[PDB]
Design a binder for this molecule. Structure first.
Ligand code: BCL
Ligand code: BCL
Ligand code: BCL
Ligand code: BCL
Ligand code: BCL
Ligand code: BCL
Ligand code: BCL
Ligand code: G2O
Ligand SMILES: CCCCCCCCCCCCCCCCCC(=O)OC[C@H](CO[C@@H]1O[C@H](CO)[C@H](O)[C@H](O)[C@H]1O)OC(=O)CCCCCCCCCCCCCCCCC
Ligand SMILES: CCCCCCCCCCCCCCCC(=O)OC[C@H](COP(=O)(O)OC[C@@H](O)CO)OC(=O)CCCCCCCCCCCCCCC
Ligand code: SF4
Ligand SMILES: [Ca+2]
Lengths: 114, 50, 101, 363, 647
């Protein structure tokens, strides 16, 4: 019994090709600021009457360097900023919340009746 | 009879059956115009359930 | 409770038509993928039911290997508005990166 | 108290009864547990709707329907089953049904004509004569199913081809199939629920033409023996109260499990809640033990304290004599159990306990 | 401004930071105590009166550490007592900062033995932890609540001992003396001991926190402590005006306060400071040395209510700001859990019950409707009272709401119940509702708003100044912007508080004005106390005395500058400022090169819209309330002699 090994655990204490959907861009530019200054692939395209939403965002794929700064920022409010994976799948966000089947739990007697 | 008297002292406790928004409104009513206004709230809602 | 499940900007979960190939010649190569990007699905009849019900929203990108134009059912009377079937409707996302500087 | 890291589980139950000889009951059950579930795909939500209506009262061809919608890790699943069930004999039961199971984009529709024979291992009158409330009844069940699935998608065709290959190429299919369709801890539930499933026997599975294309028709029987723990065997007549079903019965349940807890909501109106013990006394039916043990399989994972309130609403002139554990409150027809012995019993059955709750009530 | 974020710091770092801040605060307390020494222990004259020590002089004299006695004798003793207590605070703060450094650096090694204790596992104080805790909180703030309750029980007990022995106030039940504060110090021990034991054995659960919640728990406790501050302000106002506190707060009026910056004995231009200095010129008031700070009686200054108002408004402003900050930080946590997807996974009423957007919309709509109703009612009452008193449109004061006193069932809260108190209560409710619009927007519409879920947009960055002119403009839609709007809206409720406590007549804008019936309110309403002039004329009356002080005048100018500087950043000007700063950079470049061969290679920085809003709200609040300090520090100037009818 007494013969043992020994040990001490001091726990006890004792490719990417990012794109922008021109349909959904709102021209906020939160992704432009993330683009590296010299790259500046993301640019503004104006149709007219800025308040009517003419201004939009576009990524010049030639200028883009797949640095992921635009998309990884989680800055796109509209979801226009997308990432096409090397095999191919459009990502509107770095991680979308899981889909849920929701219901309001109203108790019977004590807390939230009915 | 328990619900209505508990309401006259604790109206939001009476509307606890109702939605959280109604419960918060009844609590605010206790805070402002305590009893008369909030007692009115509880009696309206409880009589409506009837 | 519905706006906080999935992306809050899409009331109906969005499915991009990423890959489609004419070589298999059946157009089953159409491989829908949700915006989440974790399920390379296919246009099954259940997906058709979801699309007609409005639960989902199938979409097409412009900048891609072409999915199928006039080979996957297409309406060209107006600007093209691709349809899996006349009752279906695949709204094409437009993507103007090449036309603009 | 052993440990201080205890979570909380808040629960409310409601058993409203009907007077007379009726066995009907409105059962509600809300619960909220701040304990991690045991789902490897954790964000698992489900909504079940089981609605049964009576058809052909002479024949008892009552149509039961079930809709299980679910979302598990953002994977949308659904299973719908319609089935005219019928209590042919005291031992036999015959069902003719259809259904549709969908997962994400995949889906397929099936039909079936299945006969279940529940044979008790003994019908001796000594036990019945002496034991007033028999629970552990030893028995066996024989299912004989005739399922049919239109093979529409290539998934179905590939699966059918694989199964046809397997049944003839491997002689141990009847054994390992059990390993298959008791997926994951379900297999454990066989051994710890007192139920032994025998090898299946395929009389014949063979494709045939249908109205929507080829139809894979699988005719197979299997067996399911219960040592007594199995409520689907020991209590067989009480399982199927077709004779006591006149109004439509509906049970809408659901849970909203996630990484932080389980939200549960159940509403129901169905027969079989009240059972005549004898001498005019009635009981809230004996608690099935399979749910208890199968939940205790996921009940003993976290230390918890239960705030459980049961509310029994008996009919107008019905007393509740000998309701042990005893109630805490009473409004002359509405008895509340909360705390004390009842909370201990709730923690007992929320962790696999199969103890008794004898709510004997008078007339 | 985010270097000490909750995420960046762990629990031990927070413990150490709070401990070091307690030590710094003890040093500040010693500084104030020494500032309170009117006469030094060595005999020479001491420091003048500072608001920092005139705020605590009532409490200090309550504890016998200070004295209202006026002879040099026993004031020297009070100064020695204050010096001793300040030295005690200094040394204890040094020890607290040492402990804070050790906890922040995690080097919890005893300097004597070297044993490195574990924040996760540690017996408290030795054997006492074994007797009570039986072992520490292995983890969890929930298991820490009981231990903290026991710690506060020991704090209460220690204060009881200190006041019983050190400060000589034995525990006596009667609540008319400091003695009860000893008695209760023991009472609240047992309570906060027993409850602690309970919460140690039966921990509480709000699963939203406890998990990654330094920000979440911080938000909840900051909102709670803001309401604690508001309650403390109300209690301070009520109690400090009660007779039992008169020996410590009403006796201020009997003293004369030489405060820094007050009027100084002026000297003629032909003045030479040699010897008697009389021959060269004449000082303003003889018998006081030249440039000396002239006495100011507390009777005229009303120092009792001035100090009461300063304490009460300090706690009210701090509490409102803490409520707003708690809602903001809770909104940041809400947005984080919404982005990562935990929002739907929370299983508590504090998050689940408002999960639906319909209930959020209904809540905010009810708040907005109540705000509209109450604001419209109060503003109509006030403007009509102004129309009447000024006799506009042919009206007269008889048509004003002089009859609209608080009901007899609610006049207990108010000494002289009039329309002023009615307008006060309803204005407070309306300002609370207004700020609650923004607070509720933070609480619910942190990641997505019904407009934005319809417009297909989501709020991600929790600080994004906008999303652009899309949809006509998306300015100020982050939770930070809503916090700023909540602060700028609560400015008004807080003002109403200041003006109520300083004696203003907030039921009309022009009370006390020498025009029409503005001076008739006292006769028609049968008021006992002559309220300070109304909302517009209160500025004038209070500035009669603000202008008489060089120091208060300096504050006036500085706070006004700070306030109007806020528009340069809050106004929709950021792009203009950026363009102009590019022009500034080019101007500096070429002008310097022509004037001096050296090149610049430097750019003038322009605040982002997020930082612009941050600084703008900070400046707005700073100016507004640095000037509210003038309102509250001029003097109460509300006499108990009603003004007769104008005719
Ligand atoms: C669960 C334990 C047993 C078992 C016990 C029983 C019993 C007992 C019976 C059947 C019945 C059937 N079984 Mg079986 N069954 C087992 C496994 C199987 C498997 C398999 C997984 O391989 C298959 C294919 C089948 C096939 C079938 C069908 C032939 C038949 C009708 C089902 C249907 O309509 O349900 C429709 C679907 C539902 C009703 C969904 C909910 C199912 C649960 C188990 C019931 C909960 C009831 C709830 C507490 C109260 C509801 C009240 C509402 C008002 C209705 N069983 C296991 C081994 N099965 C019936 C029969 O005899 O048919 C002739 C029957 O009475
Ligand atoms: C080895 C166990 C003991 C025994 C122990 C018990 C106990 C204890 C009880 C009963 C009870 C019963 N016994 Mg017995 N019983 C024995 C022998 C018999 C014989 C016989 C001719 O030998 C018969 C006809 C019976 C008859 C009966 C039933 C009428 C009665 C209720 C049903 C029950 O489940 O039975 C159980 C019957 C069996 C355990 C065995 C029956 C043996 C049969 C007849 C022949 C051999 C079968 C097989 C080859 C080998 C035995 C397998 C065993 C199951 C282990 N017993 C043997 C010697 N029996 C129960 C009671 O009182 O009911 C009111 C009860 O609680
Ligand atoms: C195909 C399935 C079988 C069947 C198999 C079972 C089994 C097995 C059990 C019951 C049980 C009961 N069934 Mg049945 N039963 C069938 C037909 C019916 C019919 C009818 C006239 O058709 C009715 C009205 C009932 C009604 C009832 C009650 C008598 C009893 C539950 C009492 C209680 O209070 O529940 C209150 C229950 C609720 C508060 C919660 C209900 C939760 C959900 C909605 C149902 C369980 C779902 C399960 C865990 C998950 C899916 C299972 C399958 C994998 C699809 N069943 C069919 C023919 N029934 C139980 C009983 O007591 O047996 C003696 C039991 O053990
Ligand atoms: C103004 C309205 C709100 C407010 C709005 C915000 C906003 C907006 C932000 C925070 C942020 C933070 N706030 Mg806050 N918050 C409020 C009240 C509080 C209180 C409190 C007094 O109880 C606390 C403990 C906190 C705590 C915190 C942290 C969780 C976090 C990071 C602070 C730090 O590292 O900044 C580092 C800078 C500080 C130490 C503060 C600045 C003060 C300087 C350093 C003090 C000494 C010098 C001198 C005396 C005074 C300054 C002027 C001089 C001219 C130099 N807030 C007030 C009432 N808070 C930030 C964070 O990252 O959120 C996640 C953030 O963006
Ligand atoms: C009275 C009880 C209040 C409270 C009052 C304060 C105050 C007041 C402050 C903090 C500070 C902090 N609080 Mg706190 N705090 C409470 C409860 C919490 C809880 C919790 C419940 O578990 C948490 C997680 C926190 C979290 C934190 C950290 C963000 C920070 C301590 C780290 C540290 O010092 O960094 C190391 C940083 C240093 C020691 C540098 C400090 C520099 C100067 C001296 C203080 C800077 C801030 C500002 C000037 C203080 C303004 C007060 C206003 C006058 C209203 N608070 C409640 C709500 N807490 C401090 C902080 O950093 O604020 C930004 C701080 O000043
Ligand atoms: C003003 C002093 C500071 C401080 C400064 C120090 C210093 C300095 C050291 C530690 C050490 C430790 N500190 Mg400390 N620490 C403070 C408050 C805390 C708190 C808390 C209750 O919130 C926690 C969680 C801890 C955690 C810890 C432990 C991990 C460790 C002691 C191990 C143990 O078994 O010691 C048993 C005793 C403890 C748990 C200490 C509890 C804190 C007490 C109040 C320290 C008082 C010091 C003071 C000079 C003496 C006055 C005693 C009078 C009775 C008032 N400290 C106090 C408020 N801490 C010590 C060490 O490493 O020990 C091996 C050490 O040398
Ligand atoms: C009441 C005691 C505490 C309190 C304790 C907590 C706790 C604990 C939590 C929050 C949390 C939050 N709090 Mg709080 N909070 C209080 C005061 C406030 C005030 C305020 C100005 O009065 C506001 C605007 C907020 C705002 C917020 C949000 C930032 C956040 C909830 C978001 C959400 O989705 O809610 C959804 C909407 C609701 C649930 C609406 C219904 C309200 C609930 C059911 C309770 C109050 C109503 C009550 C029943 C009224 C009737 C009776 C009266 C008591 C007389 N708190 C006071 C100081 N708060 C959570 C958060 O994430 O913190 C970071 C959290 O964990
Ligand atoms: C004291 C108050 C103010 C200034 C001081 C000032 C100075 C200033 N401003 Mg301003 N401003 C407002 C107040 C003040 N703006 C308000 C209330 C609004 C709301 C509408 C507002 C709005 C805009 C827009 C929209 C734009 C600008 C600019 C722009 C400048 C860049 C170059 C220039 O104008 O120099 C000309 C301006 C001067 C050099 C001013 C001379 C100094 C002084 C005598 C003393 C400074 C006192 C000091 C501020 C107190 C504390 C300092 C210390 C003790 C901590 C620039 C130096 C913009 C440009 O960059 O384009 C030119 C631009 O586009 N504004
Ligand atoms: C609940 C209903 C809400 C209304 C609140 C009652 C306000 C009336 C009041 O002052 O009480 C009336 C009491 C006493 O009212 C009398 O008023 C007189 C003036 O005519 C003098 O002040 C007397 O001293 C006092 O007795 O006053 C107070 O308690 C003042 C302390 C501060 C109270 C207001 C704090 C509210 C903070 C909210 C700030 C909102 C920011 C957004
Ligand atoms: C509390 C808030 C904490 C701090 C925030 C407070 C703060 O940031 O201030 C607010 C705001 C500064 O915001 P801006 O981003 O526009 O500053 C850009 C500056 O470079 C001025 O162009 O100040 C004002 O514009 C008014 C005061 C400017 C006066 C300074 C004059 C600067 C002179 C520059 C040279 C001019 C010569 C022209 C050469 C051509
Ligand atoms: S005016 Fe300024 S804050 Fe408003 S949307 Fe345009 S850039 Fe943003
Ligand atoms: Ca004043």
């Amino acid at each position: 019994e007494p013969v043992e090994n020994k040990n001490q655990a001091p726990a006890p204490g004792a490719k990417k090709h990012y794109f922008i959907i021109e349909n959904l861009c709102v021209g906020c530019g939160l992704c432009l600021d993330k683009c590296p200054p010299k790259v500046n692939a993301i640019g503004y395209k104006f149709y007219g009457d800025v308040q009517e939403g003419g201004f939009r965002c576009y990524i010049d794929q030639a200028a883009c360097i797949s640095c992921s700064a635009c998309f990884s920022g989680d800055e796109c409010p509209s979801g226009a900023l997308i990432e096409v994976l090397p095999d191919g799948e459009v990502l509107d966000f770095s991680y979308t919340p899981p889909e849920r089947l929701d219901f309001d739990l109203r108790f019977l007697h004590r807390f939230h009746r009915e | 009879i328990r619900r209505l008297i508990l309401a006259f002292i604790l109206p939001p406790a009476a509307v606890m059956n109702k939605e959280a928004g109604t419960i918060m409104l009844t609590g605010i009513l206790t805070l402002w115009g305590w009893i008369p206004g909030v007692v009115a709230a509880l009696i309206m809602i409880s009589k409506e359930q009837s | 409770s519905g706006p906080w499940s999935g992306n809050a900007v899409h009331k109906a979960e969005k499915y991009f038509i990423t890959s489609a190939k004419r070589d298999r010649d059946g157009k089953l190569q159409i491989e829908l993928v949700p915006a989440s990007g974790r399920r390379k699905l296919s246009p099954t009849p259940e997906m058709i039911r979801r699309l007609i019900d409005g639960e989902i929203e199938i979409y097409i990108l412009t900048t891609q290997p072409d999915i199928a134009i006039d080979m996957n059912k297409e309406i060209i009377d107006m600007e093209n508005r691709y349809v899996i079937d006349f009752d279906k409707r695949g709204v094409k996302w437009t993507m103007r990166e090449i036309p603009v500087f | 108290f052993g440990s201080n890291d205890v979570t909380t589980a808040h629960s409310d139950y409601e058993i409203v009864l009907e007077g007379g000889s009726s066995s009907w009951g409105k059962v509600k059950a809300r619960a909220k547990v701040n304990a991690p579930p045991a789902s490897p795909l954790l964000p698992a939500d489900c909504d079940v709707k089981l609605n049964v209506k009576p058809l052909d009262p002479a024949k008892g061809f009552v149509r039961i329907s079930a809709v299980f919608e679910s979302i598990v890790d953002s994977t949308k699943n659904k299973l719908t089953i319609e089935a005219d069930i019928a209590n042919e004999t005291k031992e036999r039961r015959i069902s003719v049904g259809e259904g549709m199971v969908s997962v994400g984009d995949f889906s397929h529709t099936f039909s079936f004509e299945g006969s279940v024979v529940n044979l008790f291992y003994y019908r001796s009158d000594a036990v019945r004569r002496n034991v007033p409330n028999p629970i552990y009844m030893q028995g066996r069940q024989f299912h004989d199913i005739l399922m049919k699935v239109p093979l529409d998608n290539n998934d179905l065709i590939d699966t059918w081809e694989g199964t046809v290959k397997a049944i003839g190429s491997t002689g141990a299919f009847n054994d390992w199939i059990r390993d298959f369709w008791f997926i994951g801890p379900a297999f454990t539930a066989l051994n710890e629920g007192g139920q032994r499933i025998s090898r299946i026997e395929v009389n014949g599975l063979n494709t045939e033409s249908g109205p929507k294309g080829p139809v894979g028709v699988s005719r197979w029987r299997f067996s399911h023996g219960g040592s007594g723990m199995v409520d689907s065997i020991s209590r067989w007549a009480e399982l199927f109260p077709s004779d006591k079903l006149n109004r439509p019965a509906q049970v809408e349940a659901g849970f909203r499990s996630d990484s932080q807890g389980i939200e549960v909501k159940v509403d129901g109106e169905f027969p079989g809640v009240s059972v005549d013990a004898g001498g005019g006394l009635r009981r809230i039916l004996n608690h099935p033990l399979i749910p208890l043990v199968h939940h205790g399989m996921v009940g003993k994972f976290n230390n918890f304290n239960v705030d459980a309130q049961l509310k029994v609403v008996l009919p107008k002139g019905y007393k509740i004599r000998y309701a042990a554990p005893q109630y805490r409150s009473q409004n002359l027809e509405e008895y509340r159990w909360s705390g004390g012995a009842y909370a201990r019993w709730v923690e007992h059955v929320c962790k696999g306990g199969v103890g008794q709750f004898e709510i004997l009530y008078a007339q | 401004y985010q270097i000490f974020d909750t995420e960046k710091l762990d629990d031990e770092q927070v413990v150490g930071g709070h401990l070091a801040l307690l030590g710094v605060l003890g040093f500040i307390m010693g500084i104030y105590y020494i500032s309170g020494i009117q006469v030094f222990p060595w005999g020479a004259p001491g420091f003048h009166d500072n608001w920092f020590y005139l705020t605590i002089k009532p409490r200090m004299v309550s504890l016998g550490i200070d004295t209202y006695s006026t002879k040099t004798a026993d004031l020297e003793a009070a100064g020695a007592r204050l010096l001793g207590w300040a030295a005690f605070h200094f040394l204890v703060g040094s020890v607290l900062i040492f402990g804070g450094w050790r906890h922040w650096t995690h080097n919890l090694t005893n300097p004597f033995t070297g044993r490195c204790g574990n924040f996760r596992d540690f017996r408290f104080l030795g054997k006492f932890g074994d007797v009570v805790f039986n072992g520490t909180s292995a983890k969890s703030y929930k298991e820490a609540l009981g231990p903290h309750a026991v710690y506060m029980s020991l704090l209460f007990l220690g204060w009881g001992i200190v006041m019983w022995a050190i400060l000589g106030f034995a525990p006596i039940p009667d609540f008319q003396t400091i003695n009860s504060e000893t008695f209760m110090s023991f009472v609240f021990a047992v309570i906060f001991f027993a409850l602690g034991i309970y919460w140690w054995n039966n921990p509480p659960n709000a699963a939203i926190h406890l998990n990654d919640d330094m920000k979440a728990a911080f938000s909840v406790h900051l909102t709670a402590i803001g309401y604690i501050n508001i309650a403390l302000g109300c209690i301070a106002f009520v109690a400090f005006q009660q007779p039992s506190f008169a020996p410590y707060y009403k006796e201020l009026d009997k003293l004369v306060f030489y405060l820094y910056g007050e009027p100084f004995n002026r000297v003629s231009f032909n003045f030479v400071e040699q010897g008697g200095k009389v021959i060269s010129g004449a000082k303003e008031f003889a018998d006081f040395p030249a440039y000396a700070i002239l006495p100011k009686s507390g009777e005229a200054f009303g120092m009792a209510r001035v100090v009461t108002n300063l304490i009460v408004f300090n706690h009210i402003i701090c509490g409102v700001l803490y409520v707003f900050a708690g809602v903001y930080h809770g909104g940041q946590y809400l947005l984080k859990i919404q982005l990562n997807g935990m929002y739907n996974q929370i299983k508590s009423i504090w998050i689940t019950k408002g999960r639906d957007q319909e209930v959020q919309v209904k809540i905010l709509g009810t708040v907005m409707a109540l705000c509209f109703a109450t604001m419209l009612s109060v503003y109509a009452v006030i403007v009509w009272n102004t129309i009447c008193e000024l006799n506009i449109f042919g009206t007269n004061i008889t048509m004003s709401f002089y009859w609209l006193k608080p009901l007899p069932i609610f006049q207990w809260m108010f000494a002289d119940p009039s329309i002023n108190d009615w307008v006060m209560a309803h204005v407070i409710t309306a300002g609370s509702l207004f700020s609650l619009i923004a607070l509720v927007r933070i609480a619910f519409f942190a990641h997505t708003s019904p407009l934005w879920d319809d417009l297909g947009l989501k709020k991600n960055s929790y600080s994004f100044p906008c999303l652009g002119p899309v949809y006509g403009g998306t300015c100020g839609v982050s939770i930070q912007d809503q916090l700023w709007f909540a602060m700028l809206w609560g400015i008004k409720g807080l003002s109403a508080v200041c003006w109520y406590i300083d004696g203003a007549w907030i039921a009309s804008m022009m009370y006390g004005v020498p025009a029409a019936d503005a001076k008739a309110w006292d006769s028609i309403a049968h008021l006992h106390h002559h309220y300070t002039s109304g909302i517009f004329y209160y500025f004038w009356t209070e500035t009669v005395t603000i202008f008489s002080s060089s120091h208060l005048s300096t504050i006036l100018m500085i706070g006004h500058l700070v306030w109007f500087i806020s528009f340069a950043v809050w106004f929709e000007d950021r792009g203009s400022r950026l363009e102009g700063a590019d022009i500034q950079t080019r101007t500096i470049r070429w002008l310097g090169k022509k004037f001096l061969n050296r090149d610049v290679n430097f750019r003038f920085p322009v605040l982002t819209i997020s930082d612009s809003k941050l600084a703008g709200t900070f400046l707005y609040f700073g100016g507004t309330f640095m000037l509210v300090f003038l309102f509250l520090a001029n003097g109460f100037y509300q006499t108990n002699s009603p003004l007769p009818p104008p005719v």
